[PDB]
Amino acid sequence: KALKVRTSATFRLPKTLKLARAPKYASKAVPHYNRLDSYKVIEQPITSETAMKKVEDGNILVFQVSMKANKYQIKKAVKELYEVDVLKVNTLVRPNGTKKAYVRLTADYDALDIANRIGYI
Amino acid sequence: AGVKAYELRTKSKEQLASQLVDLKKELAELKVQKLSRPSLPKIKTVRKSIACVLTVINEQQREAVRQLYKGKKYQPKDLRAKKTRALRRALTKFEASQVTEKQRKKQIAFPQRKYAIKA
Amino acid sequence: GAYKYLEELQRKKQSDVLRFLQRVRVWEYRQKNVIHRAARPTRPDKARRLGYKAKQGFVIYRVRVRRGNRKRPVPKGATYGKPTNQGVNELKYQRSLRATAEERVGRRAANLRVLNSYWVNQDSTYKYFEVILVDPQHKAIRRDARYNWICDPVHKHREARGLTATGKKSRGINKGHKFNNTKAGRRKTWKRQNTLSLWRYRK
Amino acid sequence: AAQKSFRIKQKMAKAKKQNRPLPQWIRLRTNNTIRYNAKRRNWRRTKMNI
Amino acid sequence: AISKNLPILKNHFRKHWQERVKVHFDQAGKKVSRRNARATRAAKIAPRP
Amino acid sequence: DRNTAAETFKLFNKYRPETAAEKKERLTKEAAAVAEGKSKQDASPKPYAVKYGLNHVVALIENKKAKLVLIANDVDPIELVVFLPALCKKMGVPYAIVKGKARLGTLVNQKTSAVA
RNA sequence: GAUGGGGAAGCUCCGUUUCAAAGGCCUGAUUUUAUGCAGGCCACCAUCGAAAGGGAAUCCGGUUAAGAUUCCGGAACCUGG
RNA sequence: GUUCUUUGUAAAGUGCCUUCGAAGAGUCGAGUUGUUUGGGAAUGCAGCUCUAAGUGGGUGGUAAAUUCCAUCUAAAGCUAA
RNA sequence: UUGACCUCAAAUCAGGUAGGAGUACCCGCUGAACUUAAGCAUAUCAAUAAGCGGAGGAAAAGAAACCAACCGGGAUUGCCUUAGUAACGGCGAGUGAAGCGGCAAAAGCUCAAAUUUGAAAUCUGGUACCUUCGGUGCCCGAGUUGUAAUUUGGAGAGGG
């Protein structure tokens, strides 16, 4: 025969137990593979005369790029594939709906050597 | 023609991944050549080869999951039968054939008989 | 055998005991929400004879419905027609309040099927009904052949189509000379005796 | 405009790629009736309403 | 609208009847279906009559 | 009163019912006795358990076979139980309104019983 | 303009802090503590809504056929860690 | 047409004597309102008010009382062509 | 103090289900006016169109609280007829069924209300196993505020 003592005149939800997920079956069978890997991130170089000029002069590669991709991914893909360190990436969306990346490499690497290694010029 | 799934199904996950990576490399070089030069339709074959390899990989993974959830309740929804919604809904053959005991006794006592009107 | 005593006792409604209970319970249900679940039936005899069984997948909801007529909406009381159709107020809604109740609880719990319903209380503002519902995806009811008919897809929203008892009463479906306009589908019998049937070989 | 949504720009790109005349080789095909591209959409004549 | 010596006719066509005209072109086909149903039923059922 | 109720529940807890464990035990015993003795309804002794259930108990009261009836001061659908004093008086049965359908359930191996 | 609730045969309406048990900030506990537990803190209670209102922080020179306070060079600043 | 299990001191059906024979209420029904119907002193439906019985109740197309008769058995429910 | 019950909650709890489309045909709600009446209000158009809710391959209805007044038939549905009939109707315009009969097709049943009381005999779920569109065992639970067997009116039950 005793009673609780309540200093506030407010009743709130008792913080009862939040029990965690423990499913009997997976939500999907197989994990999806990486949806945006490096070969999906970089599609094609861009070999317009302006882009090749920027290769020769600014040490800048010009790539066609997935619209779902961002600068982090582009940098990661370039470093992964062409074995190249990377400064500033700039990006635009072209008037045709594809993304264009201006990747500036560091001073140690030569974007033209990288380009003729990739095959184009 | 490229690759053949009956040749790929004898391989493992790792060989298939290496094959796929090599194919993606090749596709990239072919994309470069496609713009350096006027036309290159080998890119079609290598694209479909990538497709066949991914198909085989998905198949292997799914049959592994099936053998993991083999013969137990609560399989995944991408692995149950799809049949159609309304069929996945109302009754099964068992539940439909369920019959009360009064009706069972009456059925056994007085089933429909074969009869003929000549004599 | 208690259900018989309960039947007759609930029959004696204007007795002191049951009008005391009327008052207490109408207060209680007025305090609770318009639609709320009843843990148990308040008239187990009535639920029982209407098809309730105390097993898993039978559910009881309680529901208020606002009482009286149907005022025609008609902004500012205007109908824009002939004086036969100028009435706004004294109009009386061919379905019952029991039906409206069934509709509302079925719409709240669409995963269930309405079986039936029964009066429990009333006041001047509200009537109070208890609706019996059945879970058709519960495997007791998918089995239990006496109730597996409810799991056939031709029994979705029986209340909406008028297949409950009050729905058939309102539809006017009983036998006899008194129900000739509505014995098998008012609109269907209208349609057939306004069909011109013409054969290949005629007059 | 010039401070656009991506949704508007996406549609403008499809309209840039749609605004070309026929490939010539399509006139040469077997059972061909397409003589010209009907759905041309010059910016003077007809606005696309986004 | 009333004219020479003729009977008063009561033709009930002041409704949209053209929407509910039924012509039984299906007469002979329904007959065929009915015979086939009888035959199927006999066979499927039994020697029962 | 609490003392009388204590005595009452002692008396009833002597005549508790069966549970599943000892029911399976006596089922084994009877399956054995039907094999060896072949004595049907003669192996296990007569049970002297307490009778529960409302329809059961009402029928017992009507046929005057009940010797003592306990009734809960509980149930909320009170119509279930209001008529029982009148019955026990009409039929000459001693009835007692005790506190706790939960007590009755505890002795009778349920949660609630409402009578005993 | 949701929710809670209430209306409405219903499409939906009201209303946005309400007749709601409408949550989180930290602390210890510590090297069983995962994050529970001994505690104490708070009361308000969605979301949308302004390329002219509020608002963290950049300038110069040069450069293209056509881009630039966005690129090159140089010189700075803010935020977060 | 074949083959394996006989589940079964289980279940069902049939005759005579006797004692019983539970049968659905805010419902039926009535008054009023409105709507509807070929339905006419009110065919059905609905709202409000009143509200039953048990050898009873409904129906028997002119309202009412009295006496009879005939025929069904509501207010719970499933079901092919 | 410890452990129950009742009621009520919360959980990204385990497992499920509802939504929307289509909508010719079907079940309902809601609901006009044009028009006809040589005007027009009742009426008629029409218990229609439009609006809303809800289903299936058909739906609904359905095994009498029926029809009848017969020497009595006997669930429902549909066709031929009854019938432009009885009846309604500013008895004006107009509206307007049903029983019988002939045929197609045919099919019948289930619950509640009963103490099993010498034995909740019933059921979901979880787990282990298996000849796995389900079965057996074991364990929590639901449930006697009544789950199974038995009986539904044509009958039927308890005894002998």
From Swiss-Prot, chain A:
GO terms for cellular component: cytosol; cytosolic large ribosomal subunit; preribosome, large subunit precursor. There is a cross-link at K40 (Glycyl lysine isopeptide (Lys-Gly) (interchain with G-Cter in SUMO)). It is found in: Cytoplasm. One of its GO terms (biological process) is cytoplasmic translation. Keywords: Cytoplasm, Isopeptide bond, Ribonucleoprotein, Ribosomal protein, RNA-binding, rRNA-binding, Ubl conjugation. One of its GO terms (molecular function) is rRNA binding. Gene3D superfamilies: 3.30.70.330. InterPro entries: Nucleotide-bd_a/b_plait_sf, Ribosomal_uL23-like, Ribosomal_uL23/eL15/eS24_sf, Ribosomal_uL23_CS, Ribosomal_uL23_N. Component of the large ribosomal subunit (LSU). Mature yeast ribosomes consist of a small (40S) and a large (60S) subunit. The 40S small subunit contains 1 molecule of ribosomal RNA (18S rRNA) and 33 different proteins (encoded by 57 genes). The large 60S subunit contains 3 rRNA molecules (25S, 5.8S and 5S rRNA) and 46 different proteins (encoded by 81 genes). uL23 is associated with the polypeptide exit tunnel. Belongs to the universal ribosomal protein uL23 family. HAMAP family: Ribosomal_uL23_A. This is Large ribosomal subunit protein uL23. The gene is RPL25.
UniProtKB/Swiss-Prot annotation, chain B:
Keywords: Cytoplasm, Phosphoprotein, Ribonucleoprotein, Ribosomal protein. It is found in: Cytoplasm. There are 2 genes for uL29 in yeast. Pfam families: Ribosomal_L29 (PF00831). Component of the ribosome, a large ribonucleoprotein complex responsible for the synthesis of proteins in the cell. The small ribosomal subunit (SSU) binds messenger RNAs (mRNAs) and translates the encoded message by selecting cognate aminoacyl-transfer RNA (tRNA) molecules. The large subunit (LSU) contains the ribosomal catalytic site termed the peptidyl transferase center (PTC), which catalyzes the formation of peptide bonds, thereby polymerizing the amino acids delivered by tRNAs into a polypeptide chain. InterPro entries: Ribosomal_uL29, Ribosomal_uL29_CS, Ribosomal_uL29_euk, Ribosomal_uL29_sf. One of its GO terms (cellular component) is preribosome, large subunit precursor. GO terms for molecular function: mRNA binding; structural constituent of ribosome. This is Large ribosomal subunit protein uL29A. It comes from Saccharomyces cerevisiae (strain ATCC 204508 / S288c). The modification Phosphoserine is found at S12, S49. GO terms for biological process: cytoplasmic translation; maturation of LSU-rRNA from tricistronic rRNA transcript (SSU-rRNA, 5.8S rRNA, LSU-rRNA). Belongs to the universal ribosomal protein uL29 family.
Swiss-Prot record, chain C:
GO terms for molecular function: RNA binding; structural constituent of ribosome. One of its GO terms (cellular component) is cytosolic large ribosomal subunit. Residues 163-184 are annotated as: Disordered. It is found in: Cytoplasm. Residues 168-184 have a biased composition (Basic residues). Gene3D superfamilies: Ribosomal protein l15e. It comes from the Eukaryota. Coiled coil: none annotated. Its main location: cytoplasm. InterPro entries: Rbsml_eL15_core_dom_sf (IPR024794), Ribosomal_eL15 (IPR000439), Ribosomal_eL15_CS (IPR020925), Ribosomal_uL23/eL15/eS24_sf (IPR012678). The keyword Iron does not apply. GO terms for biological process: cytoplasmic translation. The keyword Cell inner membrane does not apply. Keywords: Cytoplasm, Ribonucleoprotein, Ribosomal protein. Component of the ribosome, a large ribonucleoprotein complex responsible for the synthesis of proteins in the cell. The small ribosomal subunit (SSU) binds messenger RNAs (mRNAs) and translates the encoded message by selecting cognate aminoacyl-transfer RNA (tRNA) molecules. The large subunit (LSU) contains the ribosomal catalytic site termed the peptidyl transferase center (PTC), which catalyzes the formation of peptide bonds, thereby polymerizing the amino acids delivered by tRNAs into a polypeptide chain. Component of the large ribosomal subunit (LSU). Mature yeast ribosomes consist of a small (40S) and a large (60S) subunit. The 40S small subunit contains 1 molecule of ribosomal RNA (18S rRNA) and 33 different proteins (encoded by 57 genes). The large 60S subunit contains 3 rRNA molecules (25S, 5.8S and 5S rRNA) and 46 different proteins (encoded by 81 genes).
Curated annotation (Swiss-Prot), chain F:
One of its GO terms (molecular function) is RNA binding. Keywords: Cytoplasm, Ribonucleoprotein, Ribosomal protein. GO terms for cellular component: cytosol; cytosolic large ribosomal subunit. It is found in: Cytoplasm. Its main location: cytoplasm. It comes from the Eukaryota. Component of the ribosome, a large ribonucleoprotein complex responsible for the synthesis of proteins in the cell. The small ribosomal subunit (SSU) binds messenger RNAs (mRNAs) and translates the encoded message by selecting cognate aminoacyl-transfer RNA (tRNA) molecules. The large subunit (LSU) contains the ribosomal catalytic site termed the peptidyl transferase center (PTC), which catalyzes the formation of peptide bonds, thereby polymerizing the amino acids delivered by tRNAs into a polypeptide chain. Component of the large ribosomal subunit (LSU). Mature yeast ribosomes consist of a small (40S) and a large (60S) subunit. The 40S small subunit contains 1 molecule of ribosomal RNA (18S rRNA) and 33 different proteins (encoded by 57 genes). The large 60S subunit contains 3 rRNA molecules (25S, 5.8S and 5S rRNA) and 46 different proteins (encoded by 81 genes). Present with 238000 molecules/cell in log phase SD medium. There are 2 genes for eL8 in yeast. Belongs to the eukaryotic ribosomal protein eL8 family. This is Large ribosomal subunit protein eL8A. The gene is RPL8A. The chain holds residues 83 to 198 of 256 of the full protein.
